[PDB]
Amino acid sequence: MRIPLVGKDSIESKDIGFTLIHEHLRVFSEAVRQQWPHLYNEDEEFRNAVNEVKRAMQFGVKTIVDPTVMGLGRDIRFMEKVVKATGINLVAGTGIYIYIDLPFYFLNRSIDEIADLFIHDIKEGIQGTLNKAGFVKIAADEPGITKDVEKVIRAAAIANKETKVPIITHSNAHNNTGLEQQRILTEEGVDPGKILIGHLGDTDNIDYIKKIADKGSFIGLDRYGLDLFLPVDKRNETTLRLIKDGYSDKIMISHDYCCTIDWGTAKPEYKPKLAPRWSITLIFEDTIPFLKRNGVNEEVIATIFKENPKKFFS
Amino acid sequence: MRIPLVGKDSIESKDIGFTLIHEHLRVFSEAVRQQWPHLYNEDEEFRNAVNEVKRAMQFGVKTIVDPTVMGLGRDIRFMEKVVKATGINLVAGTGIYIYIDLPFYFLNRSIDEIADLFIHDIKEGIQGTLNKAGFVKIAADEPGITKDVEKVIRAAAIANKETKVPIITHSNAHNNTGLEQQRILTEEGVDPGKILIGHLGDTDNIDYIKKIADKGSFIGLDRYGLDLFLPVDKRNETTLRLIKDGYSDKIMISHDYCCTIDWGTAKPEYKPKLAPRWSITLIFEDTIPFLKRNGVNEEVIATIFKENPKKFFS
Ligand SMILES: [Co+2]
Ligand SMILES: [Co+2]
Ligand SMILES: [Fe+2]
Ligand SMILES: [Fe+2]
Numbered sequence A, B: 001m002r003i004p005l006v007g008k009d010s011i012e013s014k015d016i017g018f019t020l021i022h023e024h025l026r027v028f029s030e031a032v033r034q035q036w037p038h039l040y041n042e043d044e045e046f047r048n049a050v051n052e053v054k055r056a057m058q059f060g061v062k063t064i065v066d067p068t069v070m071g072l073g074r075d076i077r078f079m080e081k082v083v084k085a086t087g088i089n090l091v092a093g094t095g096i097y098i099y100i101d102l103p104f105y106f107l108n109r110s111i112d113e114i115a116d117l118f119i120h121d122i123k124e125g126i127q128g129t130l131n132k133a134g135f136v137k138i139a140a141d142e143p144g145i146t147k148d149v150e151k152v153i154r155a156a157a158i159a160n161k162e163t164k165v166p167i168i169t170h171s172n173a174h175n176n177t178g179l180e181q182q183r184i185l186t187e188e189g190v191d192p193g194k195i196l197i198g199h200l201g202d203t204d205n206i207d208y209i210k211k212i213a214d215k216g217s218f219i220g221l222d223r224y225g226l227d228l229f230l231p232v233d234k235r236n237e238t239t240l241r242l243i244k245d246g247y248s249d250k251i252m253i254s255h256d257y258c259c260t261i262d263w264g265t266a267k268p269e270y271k272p273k274l275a276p277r278w279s280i281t282l283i284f285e286d287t288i289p290f291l292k293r294n295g296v297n298e299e300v301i302a303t304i305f306k307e308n309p310k311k312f313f314s
Helices: A030-035 A042-058 A076-084 A111-123 A147-163 A177-187 A206-214 A232-244 A268-274 A282-292 A298-312 B030-035 B042-058 B076-084 B111-123 B147-163 B177-187 B206-214 B232-244 B268-274 B282-292 B298-312
Strands: A003-005 A008-011 A063-065 A089-091 A094-096 A136-139 A167-170 A195-197 A218-221 A251-253 B063-066 B089-092 B136-139 B167-170 B195-197 B218-221 B251-253
Touching: A003 A089, A008 A089, A030 B030, A042 A076, A076 A089, A094 A111, A094 A147, A111 A147, A136 A147, A147 A167, A147 A177, A167 A177, A177 A195, A177 A206, A206 A218, A206 A232, A218 A232, A232 A251, A232 A282, A251 A298, A282 A298, B042 B076, B076 B089, B111 B147, B136 B147, B147 B177, B167 B177, B177 B195, B177 B206, B206 B218, B206 B232, B218 B232, B232 B251, B232 B282, B251 B298, B282 B298
Parallel strands: A063 A089, A094 A136, A136 A167, A167 A195, A195 A218, A218 A251, B063 B089, B136 B167, B167 B195, B195 B218, B218 B251
Antiparallel strands: A003 A008
16 A cells, blocks of 8 residues: 555555655666776675664664665665565665766656656566555755756656655755755645655755745654754754744654765765764664653654654655 | 776787777666666667677777767666677777767866766776776767867866876867867867777768878778768778878777667668668778779778778777
């Protein structure tokens, strides 16, 4: 029913349980991995993914939603391997991760045939495997809403309307890209409560975060641990005021953690200073205790982690 | 010794014979092929590759150099799946094909580690195999010499100095990119005679082409058949003019034909409108017969197709 799972039968939605809405098992650039496999260690990548997932499960995580898509090196056979090693509910997705331009394949190509690529993964299966896509992922950043970025957004809208699956975004918090995504999707007949505007926790600006929640979409305070974007205690006080002002029905939090990340901007040796305590369980060690002893009940955390994902996927 | 071949041991520069300097067996965007295999037909594109190669060998071609590199879907296994089916000498290369920016992997990574990737392909092998890269391919287009394009050119300079392999370039003929690649490469210690400046046959401007040749580099009259850039009759005029001005010591002629391309601007159905007679044998059907009946003799085309490829790889 409703939500498709990797290496397991489809489950209902209400059966989602405690959910981490935004985590990565591994991300890489497709071109460079395909051309130079000597840069990578698949055993190290598998060992880290398994170890990180199992510890999340120990804290009571039932389901992880992994928005790794084209441009981030989505591998469904890798996803199966860790599912079997772990017993996690894994929700894979479809979509395109870009900041500026599409690959040359998409030259002179219609929004429609891009949407057909998403609708394919949702209905037929990812990479010819039978594991179906449960959501669609789109990105936007500092370069803003470009021609090719918009085409991916409008393609996501069509896939949403025709398969009823929700859409998760990557955005820049300081840009207005998050708001623009919401606007363009809604205009094309997308129910606001089916959109998660991501990386909104990268900013102090509660007013900007609020209006996106007011327009009716889930807000992504989803990069806990990544201190370079915003430190943990800055994020803690932002989520706290949002909960106090009654936005907990729109709040979704995660880590955006990568057990293995490809980019030279984020190699393991830069971890201290940039993101010293960044893991897939950081919110259990810091955020959740902090909120509990600051006057938030566990009905609120059940909203954010259980009820909100449930409404998102139905 | 000297030139490494795909699944064919290795031969001297003297044994290269009649050569096509710039032809593609199949190009595709690495990311979309990895993410959506349903868009592709492995068997058909293999059949297209073999049919064209056999037809090329029939007409007298001994060696084909294929500058499919990162960004164009270099697959060493597909290449050796052909060859075995044909018996063609095939020179594979290394490098990066970009017009603007590198994939995220390269975010704040040095020119030296980009060079190491090219050096790995030449000295160690390509994609986990023992087949080696005999040259390095770099690119530039309408966006000009950007920041990341500069990096790859400089990494190519290091790989050449280290390994003695020559450099094949892609350039835009109407914006000085070819001259600029030559400038940077030679400044950085590369022998001008070891660079092929690509796609110079796309232009009417004869003064510009001579500019590159006078600085001692090979000139790429290498897109015969692609009428949308310049029709065959115009190219033949330019080719003959340079031959009669005595530039055949710098002239290299090819088709840039792809048996399979995934670019939406290069759909098979677009051929009769954009590049009607475009195939791997057009120079045997049009160019050479045109030249012969216009005065140019057997040693002049032997210089272009045997001797110049020999010098290049010496
Ligand atoms: Co993101
Ligand atoms: Co080219
Ligand atoms: Fe992410
Ligand atoms: Fe080419």
